Amino acid sequence: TEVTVLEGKTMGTFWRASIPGIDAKRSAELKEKIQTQLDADDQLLSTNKKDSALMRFNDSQSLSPWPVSEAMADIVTTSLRIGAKTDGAMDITVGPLVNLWGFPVQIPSQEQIDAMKAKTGLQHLTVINQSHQQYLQKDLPDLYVDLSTVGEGYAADHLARLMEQEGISRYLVSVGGALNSRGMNGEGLPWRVAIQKAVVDINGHGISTSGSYRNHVIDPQTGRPIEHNLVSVTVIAPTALEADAWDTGLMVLGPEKAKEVVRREGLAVYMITKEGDSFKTWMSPQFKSFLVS
Amino acid sequence: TEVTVLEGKTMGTFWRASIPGIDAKRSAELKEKIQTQLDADDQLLSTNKKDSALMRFNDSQSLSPWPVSEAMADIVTTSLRIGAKTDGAMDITVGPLVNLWGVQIPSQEQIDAMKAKTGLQHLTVINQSHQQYLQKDLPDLYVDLSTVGEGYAADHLARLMEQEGISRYLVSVGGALNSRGMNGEGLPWRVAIAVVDINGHGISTSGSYRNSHVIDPQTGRPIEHNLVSVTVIAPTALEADAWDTGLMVLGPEKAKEVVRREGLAVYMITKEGDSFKTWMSPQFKSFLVS
Ligand SMILES: Nc1ncnc2c1ncn2[C@@H]1O[C@H](COP(=O)(O)OP(=O)(O)O)[C@@H](O)[C@H]1O
Ligand SMILES: Nc1ncnc2c1ncn2[C@@H]1O[C@H](COP(=O)(O)OP(=O)(O)O)[C@@H](O)[C@H]1O
Ligand SMILES: [Mg+2]
Ligand SMILES: [Mg+2]
Ligand SMILES: [Mg+2]
Ligand SMILES: [Mg+2]
């Protein structure tokens, strides 16, 4: 079965969709639908866009409920929860600190860091869901929400839903470092995804890999760029949004604390760490269950 | 390639789990963990158990936020939204009307009276980083998650499989199923409805699995159209369960409009005089095996 691969730009990075058994006409039509949806998601979420739904909330000083879409509500909810579960390491309110670091020319003082830390905190954000509407609510006017670190994962999940709505049940889709697959590839086998150096089958799941994809990461506790020997983390989770959120959180925590969260939460994770000259690797038991022989 | 098949009781119905290739010690430990988790989900969601998390909320007359678990918040959020998207057909607040029909048939007057104690607009979910809440603006509101509890449990069982390093399985709770990977013959799990492969998806089939009435909230009466059966394939079994109930309540014509609009994978059976006829959405057909 011949596989069509579609590719384009979104959110400062790239997207891909591999779809077996679709003709040229259907391919062109789907590429248009895909790009249209991704552009919409970018318009929903981008901090690089002055007029995005999210930046409109960020510009607002209101402390009352601010209406948002179902997806916005869910992305924030997931981010808030995984934030708590990673001891605040994954923090969508860390924006003020990111800007402080030119995220780069001049290094901020601890005094400047402290001042900006006071404008952040996951405790300041609430999601309100009802049948016909939903809201974000902040209790700090200066709160700044940045969903950069989960936007690729959401986009990939949403691409998967689009495939389903289009009657496409076999696909591998990706946005930046986030991927989702379902069903069989061209050769009637579960989609294979290669990992930074092994191969996994993550059908029915999302996977996210650390790194910079747009054209960075700050420890919310210290208000400084991250350190540690953890050079790469890969998370497999039920959705790519979740995988993205865990991935960033774990990357911030570093090897020792990350493993503690991984163990407690029963996460499927693969880490590459640097030990002097060379590197060592670590996989949770849950991660190994996804490996293909 | 041998398949362990586990089975037990939960939520007034039965759960099932097919797992390829594991020894008896594993099968034994899993059964214990599965039953333990399903028991906890029942303690969370059951309208029978007077002391369930859900019944404690129902028992309260407070109109202020009531703390619940993440699962509870998410189940309710999904239920509220799919309720809206099925024009109120799927309605977790319909309990007062259900109880009314539990003696003698109520009049339309008695029905209209109880309608006043219902409405999806009365329920709010509040999510924060370290806690989350349900909130009702009507003390007498009664929440019943019977129609989604099976789907949630099947999804949660899938999460249990994953946390337990199991990559190939078919789990079911009542009419709700999830599957992943290859069965005891290297082929994707086959689900009889026509047969489908729904690996990586939830599926729910209409019907009674507990040991009652499905009420049309618009009329406040038992449903009485010619939609014999509806099956939904969705990203999760919770969603499938919720859609399935909504579309069953809506009946054939209205259900098809929702299915078209929302792009759902749905299979319907309707009664045409003496014979039946079938209908599949384009999306459902992508799951058919031959
Ligand atoms: N600790 C954090 N938690 C959540 N978001 C963060 C954190 N630190 C930085 N960010 C945001 O995430 C971005 C990095 O996102 P990522 O997708 O990993 O790389 P990039 O966006 O540079 O491709 C930063 O530019 C910043 O907007
Ligand atoms: N329209 C509705 N929306 C949501 N729940 C309903 C509705 N009508 C009835 N219910 C509740 O759902 C139950 C039916 O659930 P279901 O799983 O479809 O069948 P059963 O519980 O009989 O196996 C009823 O007993 C009642 O508690
Ligand atoms: Mg990136
Ligand atoms: Mg990320
Ligand atoms: Mg049932
Ligand atoms: Mg149902």
Side-chain angles (χ1 to χ4, degrees):
Chain A
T1 304
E2 188 168 296
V3 184
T4 292
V5 185
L6 307 174
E7 187 179 77
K9 293 187 175 307
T10 188
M11 302 180 66
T13 177
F14 292 80
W15 64 268
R16 291 172 158 180
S18 304
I19 306 156
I22 54 170
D23 58 34
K25 176 182 175 61
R26 187 71 179 104
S27 294
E29 289 170 348
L30 196 64
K31 179 173 181 168
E32 177 179 311
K33 284 179 173 178
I34 288 170
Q35 192 62 59
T36 296
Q37 184 173 284
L38 287 170
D39 290 347
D41 289 346
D42 196 36
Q43 166 57 36
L44 177 76
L45 300 170
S46 184
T47 60
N48 197 32
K49 296 192 172 262
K50 185 186 177 186
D51 62 322
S52 67
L54 182 63
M55 279 306 315
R56 287 182 172 279
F57 175 67
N58 281 341
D59 294 341
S60 171
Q61 299 304 295
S62 178
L63 303 186
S64 65
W66 180 276
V68 300
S69 71
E70 288 181 357
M72 178 75 83
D74 290 350
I75 293 156
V76 170
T77 291
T78 297
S79 298
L80 291 177
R81 292 175 178 178
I82 287 175
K85 292 171 184 180
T86 60
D87 304 323
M90 153 62 179
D91 185 348
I92 57 173
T93 74
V94 76
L97 291 164
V98 177
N99 293 323
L100 198 62
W101 284 86
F103 290 169
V105 189
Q106 188 168 16
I107 295 135
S109 66
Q110 185 63 47
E111 288 83 4
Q112 295 171 292
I113 288 172
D114 288 343
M116 295 295 99
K117 279 174 77 178
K119 303 184 174 183
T120 77
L122 298 174
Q123 70 275 18
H124 295 303
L125 194 56
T126 302
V127 177
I128 306 161
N129 293 320
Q130 291 169 340
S131 186
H132 287 105
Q133 57 281 324
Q134 49 285 317
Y135 309 86
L136 303 182
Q137 185 168 27
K138 56 178 170 199
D139 70 359
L140 184 62
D142 289 357
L143 199 76
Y144 187 95
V145 181
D146 191 337
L147 301 176
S148 296
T149 211
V150 289
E152 295 165 11
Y154 170 72
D157 290 337
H158 195 203
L159 277 192
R161 193 72 192 104
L162 176 60
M163 295 301 95
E164 290 163 0
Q165 288 171 322
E166 290 296 317
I168 298 163
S169 65
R170 308 166 56 183
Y171 56 80
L172 172 39
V173 297
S174 70
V175 180
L179 299 87
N180 206 268
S181 77
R182 260 151 190 74
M184 311 170 293
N185 61 18
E187 304 171 6
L189 295 160
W191 299 93
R192 307 283 187 264
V193 174
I195 299 163
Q196 290 195 29
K197 302 180 177 63
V199 54
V200 288
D201 162 24
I202 52 86
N203 268 3
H205 297 79
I207 185 170
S208 172
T209 300
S210 56
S212 184
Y213 292 93
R214 301 184 192 227
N215 195 252
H216 32 295
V217 177
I218 275 178
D219 186 330
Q221 181 70 90
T222 67
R224 303 173 153 210
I226 50 167
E227 191 188 5
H228 52 66
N229 304 342
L230 182 47
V231 56
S232 195
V233 58
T234 297
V235 182
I236 302 174
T239 69
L241 165 57
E242 288 170 86
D244 244 11
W246 287 118
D247 196 83
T248 294
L250 296 176
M251 173 53 51
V252 163
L253 288 168
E256 188 168 330
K257 289 169 179 185
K259 289 179 185 176
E260 298 174 11
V261 170
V262 163
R263 185 169 299 100
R264 178 169 62 250
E265 296 289 347
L267 303 175
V269 183
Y270 164 70
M271 297 174 205
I272 300 172
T273 312
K274 200 177 191 186
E275 301 291 67
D277 201 319
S278 72
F279 310 89
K280 69 174 292 191
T281 62
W282 183 90
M283 295 175 172
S284 67
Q286 294 85 353
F287 191 94
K288 297 180 178 176
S289 73
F290 289 96
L291 291 168
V292 181
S293 60
Chain B
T1 53
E2 310 175 42
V3 185
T4 305
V5 186
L6 309 175
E7 191 184 66
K9 293 193 284 273
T10 187
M11 307 182 56
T13 185
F14 301 84
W15 66 263
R16 210 165 260 175
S18 293
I19 307 174
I22 37 168
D23 47 23
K25 61 178 71 172
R26 198 77 180 90
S27 306
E29 274 198 340
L30 275 171
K31 187 191 190 72
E32 181 61 25
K33 279 172 176 161
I34 289 169
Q35 192 64 54
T36 301
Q37 180 175 287
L38 290 173
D39 282 359
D41 287 348
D42 194 47
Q43 171 57 27
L44 178 72
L45 299 179
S46 185
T47 48
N48 294 31
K49 297 183 173 174
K50 177 174 180 181
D51 64 320
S52 70
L54 180 57
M55 281 308 304
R56 285 163 173 173
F57 174 68
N58 286 328
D59 288 348
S60 170
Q61 300 291 278
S62 178
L63 305 183
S64 65
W66 180 275
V68 301
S69 71
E70 292 181 352
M72 177 74 84
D74 290 352
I75 292 159
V76 174
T77 293
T78 297
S79 293
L80 293 171
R81 293 170 178 180
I82 287 178
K85 293 171 185 183
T86 58
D87 298 333
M90 154 64 185
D91 190 344
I92 55 173
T93 67
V94 76
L97 292 168
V98 177
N99 292 325
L100 188 63
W101 281 89
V103 281
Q104 327 166 28
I105 170 171
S107 59
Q108 198 61 72
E109 182 278 328
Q110 303 172 266
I111 289 169
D112 293 350
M114 284 296 99
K115 280 182 176 181
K117 298 198 174 199
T118 76
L120 297 173
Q121 73 276 17
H122 293 298
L123 196 56
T124 301
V125 180
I126 303 165
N127 294 318
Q128 292 171 333
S129 63
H130 281 105
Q131 57 282 321
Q132 49 286 313
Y133 305 88
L134 301 184
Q135 186 172 22
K136 62 188 174 203
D137 68 354
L138 194 71
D140 300 342
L141 198 79
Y142 186 90
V143 181
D144 175 13
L145 302 176
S146 289
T147 60
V148 288
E150 295 169 17
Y152 171 68
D155 289 333
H156 196 196
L157 281 189
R159 281 197 290 278
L160 179 59
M161 293 300 96
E162 297 165 352
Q163 274 169 341
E164 292 296 309
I166 295 149
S167 69
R168 304 159 60 184
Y169 58 83
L170 173 68
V171 296
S172 69
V173 182
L177 302 85
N178 281 310
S179 78
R180 176 173 208 273
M182 297 158 288
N183 56 4
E185 295 181 321
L187 290 169
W189 299 97
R190 293 179 173 186
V191 172
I193 304 164
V195 295
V196 281
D197 163 29
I198 49 80
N199 270 352
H201 303 265
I203 186 170
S204 173
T205 306
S206 61
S208 183
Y209 293 94
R210 295 192 176 87
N211 185 262
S212 67
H213 301 90
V214 174
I215 277 151
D216 184 337
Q218 315 314 316
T219 68
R221 304 154 56 97
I223 53 175
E224 53 195 333
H225 44 57
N226 293 346
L227 187 47
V228 178
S229 198
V230 44
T231 302
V232 183
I233 299 164
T236 69
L238 169 57
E239 289 170 275
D241 220 354
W243 284 118
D244 196 84
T245 294
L247 300 174
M248 175 58 86
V249 167
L250 285 174
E253 179 176 327
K254 295 187 182 193
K256 286 175 190 181
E257 291 166 22
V258 173
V259 168
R260 169 178 175 86
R261 176 166 68 243
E262 296 284 351
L264 303 176
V266 177
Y267 167 78
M268 305 180 198
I269 299 168
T270 59
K271 179 180 174 176
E272 297 284 309
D274 301 329
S275 184
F276 310 106
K277 76 176 294 178
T278 58
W279 180 95
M280 293 174 181
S281 71
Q283 293 88 352
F284 190 93
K285 294 176 177 172
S286 62
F287 297 102
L288 291 167
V289 180
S290 194

